[PDB]
Design a protein around this nucleic acid. Structure first.
Lengths: 185, 44, 68, 142, 179
RNA sequence: GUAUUGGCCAGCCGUGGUGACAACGGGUAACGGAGGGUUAGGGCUCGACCCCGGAGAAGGAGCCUGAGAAACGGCUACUACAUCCAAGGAAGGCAGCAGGCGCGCAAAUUACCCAAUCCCGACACGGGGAGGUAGUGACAAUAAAUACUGAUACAGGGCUCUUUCGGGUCUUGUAAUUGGAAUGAGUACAAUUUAAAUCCCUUAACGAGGAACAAUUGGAGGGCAAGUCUGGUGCCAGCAGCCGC
């Protein structure tokens, strides 16, 4: 029965009460407003629900049986990230449209991905260890055709510092179980 | 072009540019005095 | 500068002065005292209140005993 | 050559100028008042609207870029138009349902540059002013 | 409806012309003006005179309108001193130029009659309450001094240079050193 | 019948009146004029708005008093809004001055006064949100702060003696040195201003040495005046009225 938009406001108010001196200048810590946690589904890292880290009017409620990844990010910069840099991360869309590919090279990679990774995310090095050496043409073609999604690195402004903490929690029928808790954090 | 594009890349260059500060310099005369200095350089 | 310009009035007799001078000038010289009155809005408000009474408006408490 | 030149032919000369004056394009649009009728703005300079979504528009043939326009519905009469957000990285300042204020490109009803089918630009967002936010002269209210 | 206003300058049509840009700057530096506006203002008041003379010149000779207004126009220019007595003719006012008007202003007249070392020193003395014409204290640099009043410019009676008492900082130094 | 003329109206009798020299009808983001803006001459465009004339007081009609009204800070009735109630009843019209809501890109104080210009009444004496004064106010227009000046050195320009690092003479410049006087931006005893105040104008005691008593807005390929210098990005991000990068 907790309201996700109200949770976001509480998270923001605690973090924003802190400040940090770097090279003689004091910087307020700002939430990265366009990042959020999410629910987790079988074999699929992102579901349909979001957990913001600023106050919003999202009234969607958490329900018995759900599992959520609660993650927060703080920054000394603008509190906003953009995509920039070399791409390493990819994932096959489960809802990919049916397409016909003239290039035979793509036809082979598509079979490899479904049979090895399914909808689980993969990286370039996971292809190298399977003996794939001439795949960059086909991978870029699968992205352009809407079959594979790319996830470029996300960066704040140069000279800023960012930190992250995240846990997985199970909303069981009886009690809440914070499954990833350890003695470290 | 099903992809159409991606709006994430807005503001890439301005964000990643290095930041450098103003360095203090002497104040310049203003008003009638500033015109007097200009006249001397261009004709004397 | 060190120059100043004004206006002057010379009267035949002291009694003739008080007859023709405006009152506000007399207060400046101290000959006459100021008039004490209430502000302009309260006087206007009182005037309109008395248009609803007919005859001997000074005392109107005779109607207090109608309720018993 | 071929005009009437007599001393009592003032009627023909006056009538002729009135008829041929319609062939002008600048005068024809002024007399019929097309701006009052067809233009999304009611013959005014600015207008207020509500942002609906963020859209990217491709540049024309020689160029190659994404122009990052936006969709807006006018409060005054409920019409829907598209507007361009100037400067570098300014879409980041605008969210959904933000009450923007618009103006023209100055080409007087025609598209400017390589951007196709766009006639308006965003001047203010949340009543703060776009350019002031860009130079960090003000902070956007929540 | 009951209030009257007017503006005293005009703006040139072409903004960036090399020939015009340096010509005005020479005039500005010579007379120690503040900006280009005072140059344009002098040009406008000179243009009004030319238009009036040009209108009258196309009239017939000995026309009563030409005689009455022509004489009044000529007398005004002689009185202020921007036109010499050897040339009282309606044709000679057309030959007047900009530098003639700038000669007969209080800022330059201070320079010519001693009283100052630089033309920039004259202006700061005018704005401060030092110079007086006749018996009246003047703090307007563009006073446009008349002819017969030229022999009465002198220091103010209350100014430290023309009498009075020592100024603000001189008194403090004398008092501080005294005790 | 009306204050009077009149197809203004009642009877009886004729068949006429306007039009291609634009009648009749439809549009007007239309009150008319004196006039505003822009200029070789000829013109184009705007005019709700301080002066003159006309109309209206939420929409229509009717009427009393009176010299003068088809009046609305006068009355009667219907339509549309809307107020108090003991449930029987009673009352209202800001396109008058302030003020609130809505509409929009778009427009100020619920302040002081009859001292001035004038009006009305039985009246030299009373009244006037007509009208005047102040607050907010970068609508426009006028005047004009942000610094001034010596000496010693160096540099160069002007002239001479003139052989060259040589000497006399003046100006200009200073990450060169020290040396001078002056002024209001503020501020504050007084007087003056004013119906009572404020501002302006005068005036004792204070008020300039740099990290101030610190000027900004747009530009540097061409049209169009001002770099082919140094980092970042790599048809991406973006600039560009136009040719373009």
């Amino acid at each position: 029965d907790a309201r996700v938009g109200e949770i976001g406001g509480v998270i923001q108010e605690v973090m924003e009460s802190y400040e940090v001196e770097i090279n003689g200048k004091t910087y307020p810590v700002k939430p990265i407003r366009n990042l959020n946690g999410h629910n987790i589904l079988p074999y699929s890292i992102h579901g349909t629900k979001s957990v913001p880290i600023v106050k919003t009017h999202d009234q969607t409620k958490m329900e018995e049986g759900d599992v959520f990844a609660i993650e927060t990010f703080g920054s000394t910069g603008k509190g906003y990230v953009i995509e920039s840099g070399e791409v390493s991360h990819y994932a096959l869309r489960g809802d990919a449209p049916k397409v016909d590919l003239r290039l035979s090279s793509a036809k082979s990679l598509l079979n490899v991905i479904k049979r090895h990774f399914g909808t689980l995310p993969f990286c370039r090095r996971f292809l190298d260890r399977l003996g794939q050496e001439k795949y960059l043409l086909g991978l870029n073609n699968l992205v352009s055709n809407g079959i594979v999604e790319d996830y470029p690195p996300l960066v704040d402004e140069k000279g800023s510092y960012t930190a992250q903490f995240e846990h997985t929690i199970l909303i069981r029928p009886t009690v809440k179980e914070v499954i990833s808790r350890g003695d470290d954090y | 072009k099903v992809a159409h594009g991606s709006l994430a890349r807005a503001g890439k260059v301005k964000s990643q540019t290095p930041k450098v500060e103003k360095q203090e310099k002497k104040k310049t005369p203003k008003g009638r005095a500033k015109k007097r200095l200009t006249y001397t350089r261009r004709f004397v | 500068g060190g120059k100043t310009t004004g206006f002057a009035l010379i009267y035949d007799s002291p009694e003739a002065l008080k007859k023709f001078e405006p009152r506000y000038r007399l207060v400046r010289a101290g000959l006459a005292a100021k008039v004490e009155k209430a502000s302009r809005q309260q006087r206007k408000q009182r005037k309109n209140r008395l248009k609803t009474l007919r005859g001997t408006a000074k005392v109107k408490g005779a109607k207090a005993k109608k309720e018993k | 050559g071929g005009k009437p030149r007599g001393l009592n032919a003032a009627r023909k000369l006056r009538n002729n100028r009135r008829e041929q004056r319609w062939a002008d394009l600048q005068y024809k649009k002024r007399a019929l008042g097309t701006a009052y009728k067809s233009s999304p703005f009611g013959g005014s300079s600015h207008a207020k609207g509500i942002v609906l979504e963020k859209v990217g528009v491709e540049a024309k043939q020689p160029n190659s870029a994404i122009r990052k326009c936006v969709r807006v519905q006018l409060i005054k009469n409920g019409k829907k138009v598209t507007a361009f957000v100037p400067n570098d990285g300014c879409l980041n300042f605008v969210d959904e349902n933000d009450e923007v204020l618009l103006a023209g490109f100055g080409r007087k009803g025609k598209a400017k540059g390589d951007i196709p089918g766009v006639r308006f630009k965003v001047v203010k967002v949340s009543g703060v002013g776009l350019l002031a936010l860009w130079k960090e002269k003000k902070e956007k209210p929540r | 409806a009951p209030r009257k206003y007017s503006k005293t300058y005009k703006v040139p049509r072409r903004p960036y012309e090399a020939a015009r840009l340096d010509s005005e700057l020479k005039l500005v530096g010579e007379y120690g003006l503040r900006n280009k506006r005072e140059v344009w203002r002098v040009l406008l008041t000179l243009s009004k005179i030319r238009r009036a003379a040009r209108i009258l010149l196309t009239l017939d000779e000995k026309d009563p309108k030409r005689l009455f207004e022509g004489n009044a126009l000529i007398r005004r220019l002689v009185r202020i001193g921007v036109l010499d007595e050897s040339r009282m003719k309606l044709d000679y006012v057309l030959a007047l130029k900009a530098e003639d008007f700038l000669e007969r202003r209080l800022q330059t007249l201070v320079y010519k009659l001693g009283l100052a070392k630089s033309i920039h020193h004259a202006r700061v003395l005018i704005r401060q309450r030092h110079i007086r014409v006749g018996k009246q204290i003047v703090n307007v640099p563009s006073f446009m001094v008349r002819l017969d009043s030229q022999k009465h410019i002198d220091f103010a009676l209350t100014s430290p240079f023309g009498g009075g008492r020592p100024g603000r900082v001189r008194r403090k130094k004398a008092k501080a050193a005294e005790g």
